[PDB]
Ligand binder design. Structure first.
Ligand SMILES: Fc1cccc(F)c1-c1ccc2[nH]nc(-c3cncc(O[C@H]4CNCCC45CC5)n3)c2c1
Length: 273
């Protein structure tokens, strides 16, 4: 079942998401990632078209898993007595964006643009498929270093997308919007756009803009690195205090800072190889 089909490799890491291992699919030597989650730690359950009780993460991944490569593909999954196991794709060589930024510091704007654009395409794809990630951040983005392609990972804090208010949140606090901090209420799209402003700031400054609740609520952005005025403007727009003042995905991608994006392969050749 799981035992024979996959050869298990080293532990890649563990956290709120559970424990993830490197691995190889025995049949064709396909590189994979093997993710284990205990049932006790799963608060958010969902149901398949089969009518089967699984972790919401499995529901969400199946809804977004198609030829589009901006989201990590779910290859298979298994239930065990006290856990679920997910077999996910694994690009090779790969590095998560948090580690990449830690090593480089602030990213050049051309590179940040390419990366941010790909994140946007991936988030739009999720939203089109009825899925809200709810934990967009550097740690949850992988870079395929050869192709220069980014992938979203870890849908364990996600939800079905809806147009009504959310009153639960389980993502990362420092990426969460002021309406959550103050009222424990938010809407999907506008909260996602706030997290994208935090992410963009992180890319171009090398760290997140806010640490404490009061800074989030105050929403005053200070630039610690040299950042173009157009990029500063896009960031401040994404981080508007009122949800309804934030741009739509379309407005973000039509913003002047976002024009003439590099292709992924060009991005790898210039910045990654
Ligand atoms: F294979 C890898 C090597 C180095 C870093 C990586 F992130 C990976 C990798 C490759 C394929 C993957 N598919 N899914 C994951 C995954 C899923 N959920 C969580 C998660 O967390 C990792 C990324 N941020 C830091 C913590 C982490 C354990 C290392 N990865 C995945 C990861």
């Amino acid at each position: 079942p799981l035992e024979s089909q996959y050869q298990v490799g080293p532990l890649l890491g563990s956290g709120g998401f559970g424990s993830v291992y490197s691995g190889i699919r025995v049949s064709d030597n396909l590189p994979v990632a093997i993710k284990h989650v205990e049932k006790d730690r799963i608060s958010d359950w969902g149901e398949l078209p089969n009518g089967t009780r699984v972790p919401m993460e499995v529901v969400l991944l199946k809804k977004v898993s198609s030829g589009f490569s901006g989201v990590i593909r779910l290859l298979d999954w298994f239930e065990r007595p006290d856990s679920f196991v997910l077999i996910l794709e694994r690009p090779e060589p790969v590095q998560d964006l948090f580690d990449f930024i830690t090593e480089r510091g602030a990213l050049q704007e051309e590179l940040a643009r390419s990366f941010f654009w790909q994140v946007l395409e991936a988030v739009r794809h999720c939203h089109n498929c009825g899925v809200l990630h709810r934990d967009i951040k550097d740690e949850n983005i992988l870079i395929d270093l050869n192709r220069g392609e980014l992938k979203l990972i870890d849908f364990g804090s996600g939800a079905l997308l809806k147009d009504t208010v959310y009153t639960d949140f389980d993502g990362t606090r420092v990426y969460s919007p002021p309406e959550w901090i103050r009222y424990h209420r938010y809407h999907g799209r506008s909260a996602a756009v706030w997290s994208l402003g935090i992410l963009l700031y992180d890319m171009v400054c090398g760290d997140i803009p806010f640490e404490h609740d009061e800074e989030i609520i105050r929403g005053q952005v200070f630039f610690r690195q040299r950042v173009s005025s157009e990029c500063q403007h896009l960031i401040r727009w994404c981080l508007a205090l009122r949800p309804s003042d934030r741009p739509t995905f379309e407005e973000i991608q039509n913003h002047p800072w976002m024009q003439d994006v590099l292709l992924p392969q060009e991005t790898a050749e210039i910045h990654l190889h």
